[PDB]
Amino acid sequence: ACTKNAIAQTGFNKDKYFNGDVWYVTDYLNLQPDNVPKRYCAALAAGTASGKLKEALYHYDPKTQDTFYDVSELQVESLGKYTANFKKVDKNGNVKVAVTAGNYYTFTVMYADDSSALIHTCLHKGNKDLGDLYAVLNRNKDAAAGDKVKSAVSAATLEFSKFISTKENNCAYDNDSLKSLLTK
Numbered sequence: 348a349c350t351k352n353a354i355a356q357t358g359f360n361k362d363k364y365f366n367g368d369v370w371y372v373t374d375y376l377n378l379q380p381d382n383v384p385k386r387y388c389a390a391l392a393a394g395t396a397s398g399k400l401k402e403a404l405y406h407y408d409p410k411t412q413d414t415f416y417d418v419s420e421l422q423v424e425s426l427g428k429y430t431a432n433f434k435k436v437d438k439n440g441n442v443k444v445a446v447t448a449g450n451y452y453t454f455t456v457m458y459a460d461d462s463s464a465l466i467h468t469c470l471h472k473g474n475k476d477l478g479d480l481y482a483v484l485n486r487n488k489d490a491a492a493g494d495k496v497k498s499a500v501s502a503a504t505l506e507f508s509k510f511i512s513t514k515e516n517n518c519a520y521d522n523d524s525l526k527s528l529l530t531k
């Protein structure tokens with residue numbers, strides 16, 4: 348179940364978030380914790396391409412080896428709040444599972460600055476969703492969450508101590524593949 352109307356950052360700077368670079372997930376929280384694993388790697392690239400907001404996603408489960416990439420076109424609901432489609436692709440942008448109506452995610456940027464961000468997403472696949480997922484992002488894959496993002500977590504009524512870190516997984520990313528997916 349999706350249960351949160353996540354509030355977008357006051358003064359959100361869309362060009363700085365959507366600048367073509369990679370964001371690494373450093374910490375995450377699902378409000379339905381059993382919906383996602385406790386060991387995981389994820390990253391995204393976000394940018395504008397051909398006049399549209401795009402994200403490219405990467406997921407990796409270091410226990411099961413499940414690996415997948417997605418390309419997403421984002422439509423604007425309001426500043427910092429988007430509805431994204433997705434197509435599953437290989438790392439080269441070739442399609443594995445096509446866009447399908449009813450497969451989509453909402454995406455809200457709750458906080459962002461030059462190095463860090465806090466986002467909410469609720470993923471829908473037909474009549475099923477993956478619950479409310481929060482992620483702390485950083486421009487540096489290893490970086491510890493700083494004071495400002497932690498203030499944003501607390502101002503959303505969340506407890507940062509409940510987030511799961513991705514650090515123990517020693518994740519590695521294919522940054523060229525991920526960024527290049529923005530034009531796919």
Ligand code: HEM
Pocket residue numbers: 372375382383384387389390391404406415416417433434435444452454468470477480482
């Ligand atoms: C960082 C922003 C994230 C976005 C925008 C996001 C979005 C998505 C999307 C679009 C899918 C479906 C992909 C497809 O079928 O083609 C998906 C699947 C999944 N996501 Fe995320 N995700 C994000 C982060 C995470 C994080 C941090 C976790 C933590 C475990 C996670 C766990 C999963 C799992 C387990 C699946 C597989 C669901 C299934 O196979 O039914 N993702 N995610």
